[PDB]
Amino acid sequence: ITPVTLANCEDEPIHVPGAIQPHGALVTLRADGMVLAASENIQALLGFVASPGSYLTQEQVGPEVLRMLEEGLTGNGPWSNSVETRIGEHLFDVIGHSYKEVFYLEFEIRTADTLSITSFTLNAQRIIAQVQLHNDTASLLSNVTDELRRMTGYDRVMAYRFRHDDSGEVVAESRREDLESYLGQRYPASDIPAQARRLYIQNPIRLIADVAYTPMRVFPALNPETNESFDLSYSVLRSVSPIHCEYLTNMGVRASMSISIVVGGKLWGLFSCHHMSPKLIPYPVRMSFQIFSQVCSAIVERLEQGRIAELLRVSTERRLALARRARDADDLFGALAHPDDGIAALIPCDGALVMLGGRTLSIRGDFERQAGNVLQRLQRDPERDIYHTDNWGDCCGVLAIRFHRQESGWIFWFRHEEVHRIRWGGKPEKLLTIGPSGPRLTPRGSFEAWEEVVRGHSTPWSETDLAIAEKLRLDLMELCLNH
């Protein structure tokens, strides 16, 4: 019965809302096919009253439907299927699935004049051609963002990248003129709490037909079998958190639809479509996006590792240049401090320090004091050959490696505090009408929430950045020992 406030919202059970969106009806069955619960609108949408204890009957739901249901009813492992069928006055999409051991049948009115197979195929071809045309991982995102809008007619579609700390950044955008831009918006990991994030990962597509909707409750609330709520995780019609709804209306959005990009076990980022009036996307089309989601995820994965590959390649090429120079010139300092192949170019940094013997070369600033303090901190830890941190002198980020012990051969890279890369301003943008929860649920409030998180922090060191440092360290050890 608990109200969901700003304090609660982190722990909101959004998977068991026990209600569904109004653009469809829902019937929940148990293993034997016996009805356990239904949305309060089954009668109003489909001509009949589903009742707990009942079993579904032909042409109160039609034949092919039970035909489908029986197949999944007798199959081990998460059944999933859909049928198209006429029930009374209308034809329906009857998407059905089984999660836990409860079976779900979802009913959407089908208004499309097209054959489903071809509608599905047509859109799949169109939206994944965008995945064959681009080598830049950012062109991919940018282009499919522009294309998703062309296909769906959404007012605004955005592509979100998720950082290491699960904070988000709007990296692409295609929007109708009128609308303010959110390009470069960065948002925290909290803007999408655990359960919501778990769900985007498990579900390629989420659709919100109308944010201003009144939910259609499924009765009864609790599954008699367990005396605990129905887990609508894989339910297409599952209802929305009032918090998110308030957020979206603060923005002035009325319909959403998001396509996930999952790589590893991580939500790599999603495409968020936003409409200013309510909007619906037919089932077969959503399936076009679902399959797309899986392929795009695959290509983004490769494109990203193709990116790291090239980073490693030019790094070694520079380690080669470095090895070449060092042996022939015989001062390392000159080699390391080289303007372009120098260490400052090896790994993205705002500065670097080279330190062998008693001599100190600070390149791109005065870093001698910091390096001294960092080194003192490592006093307590004589065995550390590598040190790094984004919390901390005057530079937040530090990556230090040791290549000579006795003569204190050290290398440092430094990073300043992370800064909002792109920022809007210039003319006060319009007044958002703000709900009861407060300004926290506006983009402006989200951004501020993000600042408070990152400030005091430099950008984390790449998986890649550390790998390079490690290779460099090996190089110099080799050199110093060798000659």
Ligand X SMILES: */C=C/C1=C(C)C(=O)N/C1=C\C1=NC(=C\c2[nH]c(/C=C3\NC(=O)C(C=C)=C3C)c(C)c2CCC(=O)O)/C(CCC(=O)O)=C1C
Query: Which residues are documented as binding site for a tetrapyrrole?
Result: 9
* 173 forms part of the interface with ligand X (CB under 6 A): no
Residue 436 Cβ vs ligand X, minimum distance, rounded to whole Å: 15
* Cβ 46 vs Cβ 238: under 8 Å: no
**Coil, strand or helix at 411:** strand
What does the alpha-carbon distance between residue 346 and residue 461 come to, in Å, rounded to a whole number?
13
Which 274-313 residues touch ligand X, going by CB under 6 A?
A: none
* Start-to-end Cα distance in the chain: 75
In the complex with ligand X, the residue whose CB is nearer, 235 or 258, is: 258
- Interface with ligand X (CB under 6 A), residue from 92, 99, 182, 413: 182
- Interface with ligand X (CB under 6 A), residue from 203, 258, 293, 458: 258
DSSP codes joined into one string, 110-137: ----S-HHHHHHHHHHHHHGGGTS-SSH
Breaks (C-N over 2.5 A) in the chain follow: 392
- Interface with ligand X (CB under 6 A), residue from 143, 446, 458, 459: 446
- Alpha helix locations (H) across 225-282? 242-251
Q: Which of these, 257, 206, 243, lies nearest to 446 by C-alpha position?
A: 243
Residue 426 Cβ vs ligand X, minimum distance, rounded to whole Å: 19
* Cβ 109 vs Cβ 92: under 8 Å: yes
In the complex with ligand X, the residue whose CB is nearer, 123 or 185, is: 185
Structure tokens at 186: 């960065």
Site string for ligand X, 4-33 (x = CB under 6 A): -----xx---x-------------------
In the complex with ligand X, the residue whose CB is nearer, 4 or 466, is: 4
In the complex with ligand X, the residue whose CB is nearer, 66 or 192, is: 192
Residue 361 Cβ vs ligand X, minimum distance, rounded to whole Å: 42
* 392 forms part of the interface with ligand X (CB under 6 A): no
Q: Which of these, 288, 353, 359, 252, lies nearest to 122 by C-alpha position?
A: 288
- Interface with ligand X (CB under 6 A), residue from 66, 87, 144, 170: 170
Residue 194 Cβ vs ligand X, minimum distance, rounded to whole Å: 9
H/E stretch holding 352:
strand 351-356
DSSP codes joined into one string, 10-32: GG---S--SEE-TTEEEEEE-TT
Stretch that binds ligand X, among 242-250, 317-325, 349-357, 413-421 (CB under 6 A): 242-250
Stretch that binds ligand X, among 49-57, 236-244, 307-315, 371-379 (CB under 6 A): 236-244
DSSP codes joined into one string, 336-376: HT-TTTSHHHHS--SEEEEEETTEEEEESS--HHHHHHHHH
Structure tokens at 308: 């790291």
List of E strands, 41-192: 80-87, 90-99, 102-109, 156-162, 168-175, 186-187
How many residues sit close enough to ligand X to count as binding (CB under 6 A)?
Answer: 28
- Interface with ligand X (CB under 6 A), residue from 62, 168, 215, 351: 168
Stretch that binds ligand X, among 81-89, 121-129, 171-179, 241-249 (CB under 6 A): 241-249
* 348 forms part of the interface with ligand X (CB under 6 A): no
In the complex with ligand X, the residue whose CB is nearer, 124 or 273, is: 273
Residue 193 Cβ vs ligand X, minimum distance, rounded to whole Å: 4
In the complex with ligand X, the residue whose CB is nearer, 187 or 367, is: 187
Residue 109: other Cβ atoms inside 10 A: 17
Residue 301 Cβ vs ligand X, minimum distance, rounded to whole Å: 21
Residue 480 Cβ vs ligand X, minimum distance, rounded to whole Å: 49
List of E strands, 373-438: 386-389, 397-404, 409-415
* 318 forms part of the interface with ligand X (CB under 6 A): no
Residue 120 Cβ vs ligand X, minimum distance, rounded to whole Å: 22
* 246 forms part of the interface with ligand X (CB under 6 A): no
Q: Which residue has the tokens 């999944």?
A: 72
* Cβ 399 vs Cβ 412: under 8 Å: yes
Spell out the long-range contacts of 371-375 with Cβ–Cβ below 8 A and sequence spacing 24 or more. Answer: 371/400, 371/410, 371/412, 374/398, 374/400, 374/412, 375/400, 375/408, 375/410
What does the alpha-carbon distance between residue 481 and residue 123 come to, in Å, rounded to a whole number?
62
What does the alpha-carbon distance between residue 174 and residue 163 come to, in Å, rounded to a whole number?
22
In the complex with ligand X, the residue whose CB is nearer, 359 or 421, is: 421
* 160 forms part of the interface with ligand X (CB under 6 A): yes
* 443 forms part of the interface with ligand X (CB under 6 A): yes
Q: Which of these, 115, 53, 46, lies nearest to 282 by C-alpha position?
A: 115
* 435 forms part of the interface with ligand X (CB under 6 A): no
* 437 forms part of the interface with ligand X (CB under 6 A): no
- Interface with ligand X (CB under 6 A), residue from 61, 192, 347, 363: 192
Which 201-220 residues touch ligand X, going by CB under 6 A?
A: 206
Stretch that binds ligand X, among 183-191, 290-298, 347-355, 381-389 (CB under 6 A): 183-191
Footprint of ligand X on this chain (CB under 6 A)? 9-10, 14, 158, 160, 168, 170, 182, 185, 187, 190-193, 196, 206, 240-241, 243-244, 247, 256, 258, 270, 272, 441, 443, 446
